Design a protein around this motif. Structure first.
Motif, PDB file in Angstrom:
ATOM      1  N   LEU A 186       0.800  -1.225   0.000  1.00 21.39           N
ATOM      2  CA  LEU A 186       0.000   0.000   0.000  1.00 21.39           C
ATOM      3  C   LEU A 186       0.833   1.276   0.000  1.00 21.39           C
ATOM      4  O   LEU A 186       1.802   1.388   0.749  1.00 21.39           O
ATOM      5  CB  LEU A 186      -1.000   0.043   1.182  1.00 21.39           C
ATOM      6  N   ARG A 187       0.409   2.266  -0.805  1.00 18.34           N
ATOM      7  CA  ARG A 187       1.087   3.563  -0.937  1.00 18.34           C
ATOM      8  C   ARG A 187       0.159   4.678  -1.513  1.00 18.34           C
ATOM      9  O   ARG A 187       0.618   5.796  -1.746  1.00 18.34           O
ATOM     10  CB  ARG A 187       2.399   3.412  -1.747  1.00 18.34           C
TER      11      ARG A 187
ATOM     12  N   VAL B   2      -3.715   5.338  -0.386  1.00 21.02           N
ATOM     13  CA  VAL B   2      -4.911   5.040   0.412  1.00 21.02           C
ATOM     14  C   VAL B   2      -5.732   6.328   0.616  1.00 21.02           C
ATOM     15  O   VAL B   2      -5.194   7.305   1.134  1.00 21.02           O
ATOM     16  CB  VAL B   2      -4.467   4.411   1.776  1.00 21.02           C
TER      17      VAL B   2
ATOM     18  N   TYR C 249      -1.710  -4.760   7.928  1.00 23.87           N
ATOM     19  CA  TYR C 249      -1.204  -4.239   6.669  1.00 23.87           C
ATOM     20  C   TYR C 249       0.271  -3.977   6.695  1.00 23.87           C
ATOM     21  O   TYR C 249       0.867  -3.682   7.749  1.00 23.87           O
ATOM     22  CB  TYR C 249      -1.972  -2.971   6.206  1.00 23.87           C
TER      23      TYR C 249
ATOM     24  N   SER D  46       2.245  -1.526   4.394  1.00 29.12           N
ATOM     25  CA  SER D  46       2.374  -0.487   3.385  1.00 29.12           C
ATOM     26  C   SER D  46       3.854  -0.491   3.001  1.00 29.12           C
ATOM     27  O   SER D  46       4.654  -1.129   3.693  1.00 29.12           O
ATOM     28  CB  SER D  46       1.980   0.872   3.966  1.00 29.12           C
ATOM     29  N   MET D  47       4.228   0.215   1.921  1.00 26.37           N
ATOM     30  CA  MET D  47       5.629   0.296   1.488  1.00 26.37           C
ATOM     31  C   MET D  47       6.547   0.772   2.597  1.00 26.37           C
ATOM     32  O   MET D  47       7.743   0.492   2.553  1.00 26.37           O
ATOM     33  CB  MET D  47       5.774   1.195   0.242  1.00 26.37           C
ATOM     34  N   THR D  48       5.998   1.495   3.600  1.00 25.59           N
ATOM     35  CA  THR D  48       6.766   1.981   4.749  1.00 25.59           C
ATOM     36  C   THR D  48       7.255   0.794   5.599  1.00 25.59           C
ATOM     37  O   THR D  48       8.427   0.752   5.961  1.00 25.59           O
ATOM     38  CB  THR D  48       5.939   2.950   5.567  1.00 25.59           C
TER      39      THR D  48
ATOM     40  N   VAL E  34       7.492  -2.334   4.449  1.00 29.03           N
ATOM     41  CA  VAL E  34       8.373  -3.140   3.576  1.00 29.03           C
ATOM     42  C   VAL E  34       9.801  -2.554   3.594  1.00 29.03           C
ATOM     43  O   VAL E  34      10.770  -3.307   3.634  1.00 29.03           O
ATOM     44  CB  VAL E  34       7.839  -3.292   2.128  1.00 29.03           C
ATOM     45  N   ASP E  35       9.917  -1.211   3.606  1.00 34.43           N
ATOM     46  CA  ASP E  35      11.202  -0.504   3.688  1.00 34.43           C
ATOM     47  C   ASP E  35      11.821  -0.749   5.068  1.00 34.43           C
ATOM     48  O   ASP E  35      12.991  -1.079   5.152  1.00 34.43           O
ATOM     49  CB  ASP E  35      10.998   1.022   3.473  1.00 34.43           C
ATOM     50  N   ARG E  36      11.018  -0.592   6.148  1.00 31.28           N
ATOM     51  CA  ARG E  36      11.432  -0.802   7.543  1.00 31.28           C
ATOM     52  C   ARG E  36      11.910  -2.240   7.825  1.00 31.28           C
ATOM     53  O   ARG E  36      12.935  -2.426   8.487  1.00 31.28           O
ATOM     54  CB  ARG E  36      10.261  -0.466   8.490  1.00 31.28           C
TER      55      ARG E  36
ATOM     56  N   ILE F 281      11.354  -7.432   2.772  1.00 25.11           N
ATOM     57  CA  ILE F 281      10.273  -8.348   2.378  1.00 25.11           C
ATOM     58  C   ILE F 281      10.300  -9.708   3.149  1.00 25.11           C
ATOM     59  O   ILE F 281       9.247 -10.312   3.332  1.00 25.11           O
ATOM     60  CB  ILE F 281      10.193  -8.528   0.845  1.00 25.11           C
TER      61      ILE F 281
ATOM     62  N   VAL G 245       4.067   5.213  -8.162  1.00 28.10           N
ATOM     63  CA  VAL G 245       5.535   5.098  -8.058  1.00 28.10           C
ATOM     64  C   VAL G 245       5.956   4.570  -6.671  1.00 28.10           C
ATOM     65  O   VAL G 245       5.183   4.676  -5.721  1.00 28.10           O
ATOM     66  CB  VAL G 245       6.263   6.425  -8.426  1.00 28.10           C
TER      67      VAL G 245
ATOM     68  N   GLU H 154      10.849  -8.616  -4.971  1.00 31.67           N
ATOM     69  CA  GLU H 154       9.898  -8.719  -3.854  1.00 31.67           C
ATOM     70  C   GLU H 154       8.618  -9.439  -4.267  1.00 31.67           C
ATOM     71  O   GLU H 154       8.131 -10.284  -3.519  1.00 31.67           O
ATOM     72  CB  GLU H 154       9.572  -7.352  -3.277  1.00 31.67           C
TER      73      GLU H 154
END
Ligand SMILES: N[C@@]1(C(=O)O)C[C@]2(CCCN2)C[C@@H]1CCC[B-](O)(O)O
Ligand SMILES: N[C@@]1(C(=O)O)C[C@]2(CCCN2)C[C@@H]1CCC[B-](O)(O)O
Ligand SMILES: N[C@@]1(C(=O)O)C[C@]2(CCCN2)C[C@@H]1CCC[B-](O)(O)O
Ligand SMILES: [Mn+2]
Ligand SMILES: [Mn+2]
Ligand SMILES: [Mn+2]
Ligand SMILES: [Mn+2]
Ligand SMILES: [Mn+2]
Ligand SMILES: [Mn+2]
Lengths: 317, 317, 317
Positions: free
Chosen positions: C177-178, C180, C195, C197-199, C201-203, C206, C247, C254
């Motif tokens: 999610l990015r 919403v 959930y 979100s890309m946050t 996944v970065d933290r 994967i 983007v 991933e």
């Protein structure tokens, strides 16, 4: 410094694979200023020139295995040159050329340092035997000829009677794998070779991969490291000018992290920069990009750190 | 909210480096609708306008250092303005312009909040002194003028006598480094500055980088945070329209991650969006791509979250 | 093997969104050779064909909701087909088509397996109700029609009387999610849905994302997994031919890691490959790239692994 003393060997050889142009790799890597760049990085560099691989006309296939005498002789002559550079107390830098040259590069290196460990950066295992191979291309078979556990599985291929297996399955680590043949996967799992496919790099991250790789190889005792870098190990967005590209590869950053960590052990002893093919670029820019990525990976093997570098002098005076 | 109360300062200045167009950074950030998007994010926005930088005739160089009086005056005027914004209880948001302006942005901010902690997101350290620099471009020197530990190592440069070093070597964290000069690397080591080069980011992941950065700055107790964001800190695949691009940078994702994390502390007090050069795009889309990323970075500093955002109301009625 | 026994259902439906071309998704996925690639992968594949979605004229909007009768009918038709495939003991493989079809795909799957857990890979939550939507496009509303907690917040929409919520807020995990909406963000938090979100996944990376997802869903006991994949969960650089690209999405790697981890549980029971729009590729290459990525994702769901695969035989004989 030992980690910055280099002997560059040019291996302009293509007959390990079907695509013309890979023999131009030593030329394109030199023209991009590799030697000059290594000297600006406080390296003691000796250029042993390009090996002449005199034509071997009449080199018919062994079953489906193509150009076996040419591939066998190129590797045999390269082994002799790598042994000579290792005896001169220099890190051997083999500029390829296709990856079949690793047979000679590793055999030649193991002649002077039999205790060496191998780090193999590639999308492929290159572990097909002349009997499991479906392409008949020897650049996808170098590892099979080198592993001790595969003795009795390698048939008598013309041009390879000089080959004696020098690495045990436990002394090799693969990184970047994403296109493995069924026969290759069977070998990999049965011999219990340590590997980090793109799945493991995704799972663990490159930090943990290198931490595990260096512990796995150097945990018992410090030994010389042979790095065999196939440029197709990186994503084709960084090294598009190569013979067998595979999507979802190692990033540019990841490629530098592996080489930065290996340099830091101080135990790099042999390096292969393979599969750069300057006639497989879709544009003139894909060629320069591939060559610059290859040059950047090489410079990191010999000390270039992203954090910066400085000489033992007072820069404020 | 204090974390969403902003004072906009345009700093259209380029003489800290030789490439024209970076003075057009405030105009293109404004054209993209930055101020409107911030207000649409529930921000209290006050626009202090774009600072007028009067041309300095006969701005002779100090040794190899170019335009010293211009860079000195532009930062002197910016310091006064940042201090005025801070005194009004707003987060100063400097729209650059080259990175030399960070001298005035941080100095101004330290006049109201002397306990500030600096996060410097960049491919470069910008910590060269007027004597260690080889280019003579002041955008690669702002940290040297700011550091207390470098007092006595900075000569009397025309236009900088108003500067008093306001930060200690222990109050700054670098993120993104991949192109550091020897003298800069020496300063980094001898002053024991905390840094996360691209090597540390590859090793730890941006999650760990951000954990350690905030723990390093906020560990003892909460204190104001100044983020100095150079767009070249991100990979040129995301921010190509910049003067000093360096391959293998932070991703679009990592950049948002850093800024979303700094927002969550509620301690952002000062912000610099620097080195956006809209004349340096190869295509009109390379310019829009750079500006879009820089706007996205700024929006996350002030609350825009990838998981989403909502008003304190009941949406199911 | 059960995890390799597949029931293919083509869903050429586009009236859940305003962009023409997504109805051609099952055709281009077939023309790429998806079934053949699955058969070569040791998969028991049965083609149930493409569902005939009869044109509904005079399909007036419900408030702002476009084509209500067409969307409800298509999902009602798909629900009976997915339920049929499931009773035949095959994994349902829905070829979308816009994401509104998830109504029919999940509902039909819960009719045979009511204890199912959902993994929703998307840049968007698709959780708007017919009352929270600002677009009125039903492809961004399927999760609201399916949740038991939102019963009473879904009005009588023509064509959706057959619907009965089949999942609770605790039976679904979002990944990627990015983008919403505020109404969706409110729903996501108040219902306490899991959930990434890309946050996150970065933290976490994967690896930890999949560890946490699978532990949350399968912790208590083993249960069937329904993966609804919106190709816009991946970055536009891998899946550009899609209606709503955002983007900073999931990488190709991933995407493969998510689908490899899901296969390894042996509990994959339903799979939706949605929102591939061949008419939205800026070049024919952007179309082929999206389709090739969507095929790569699907093959990994059914056992294709990057480390390699092999049949239970002695390959060294
Ligand atoms: N396993 C292969 C083989 O031919 O034995 C099959 C192949 C052809 C199609 C699938 N990958 C190429 C690979 C060879 C790579 C060699 B090299 O690039 O890594 O050096
Ligand atoms: N260290 C350098 C300098 O000029 O002092 C040398 C340089 C030119 C060649 C190598 N990097 C640019 C850098 C300056 C960056 C400033 B900024 O973009 O990050 O703000
Ligand atoms: N939340 C939105 C909606 O229409 O309800 C608003 C939207 C329009 C502009 C911003 N995102 C599309 C999204 C719908 C996605 C559907 B799908 O691609 O993930 O399946
Ligand atoms: Mn290889
Ligand atoms: Mn390879
Ligand atoms: Mn800078
Ligand atoms: Mn910079
Ligand atoms: Mn969707
Ligand atoms: Mn979507």
């Amino acid at each position: 410094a030992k980690s910055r003393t280099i002997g560059i060997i040019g291996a302009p050889f293509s007959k390990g694979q079907p695509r013309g142009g890979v023999e131009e790799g030593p030329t394109v890597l030199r023209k991009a200023g590799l030697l000059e760049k290594l000297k600006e990085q406080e390296c003691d560099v000796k250029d042993y020139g390009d090996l002449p691989f005199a034509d071997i006309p009449n080199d018919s296939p062994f079953q489906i295995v193509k150009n076996p005498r040419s591939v066998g002789k190129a590797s045999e002559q390269l082994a002799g040159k790598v042994a000579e550079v290792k005896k001169n107390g220099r890190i051997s830098l083999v500029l390829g050329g296709d990856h079949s040259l690793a047979i000679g590069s590793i055999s030649g290196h193991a002649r002077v340092h039999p205790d060496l460990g191998v780090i193999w950066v590639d999308a492929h295992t290159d572990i097909n035997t002349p009997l499991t191979t479906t392409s008949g291309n020897l650049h996808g078979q170098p590892v099979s000829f080198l592993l001790k556990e595969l003795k009795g599985k390698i048939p008598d291929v013309p041009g390879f009677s000089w080959v004696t297996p020098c690495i045990s399955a436990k002394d090799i680590v693969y990184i970047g794998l994403r296109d493995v043949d069924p026969g290759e996967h069977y070998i990999l799992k049965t011999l219990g070779i340590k590997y980090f496919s793109m799945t493991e790099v995704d799972r663990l991250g490159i930090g943990k991969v290198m931490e595990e790789t260096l512990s796995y190889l150097l945990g018992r005792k410090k030994r010389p490291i042979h790095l065999s870098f196939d440029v197709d190990g990186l994503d084709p967005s960084f090294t598009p000018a190569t013979g067998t590209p595979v999507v979802g590869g190692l990033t540019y950053r990841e490629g530098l992290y592996i080489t930065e960590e290996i340099y830091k052990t101080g135990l790099l002893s042999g390096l292969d920069i393979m599969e750069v093919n300057p006639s497989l670029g879709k544009t003139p820019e894909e060629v320069t990009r591939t060559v610059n990525t290859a040059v950047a990976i090489t410079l990191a093997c010999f000390g270039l750190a992203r954090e910066g570098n400085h000489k033992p002098i007072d820069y404020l005076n």
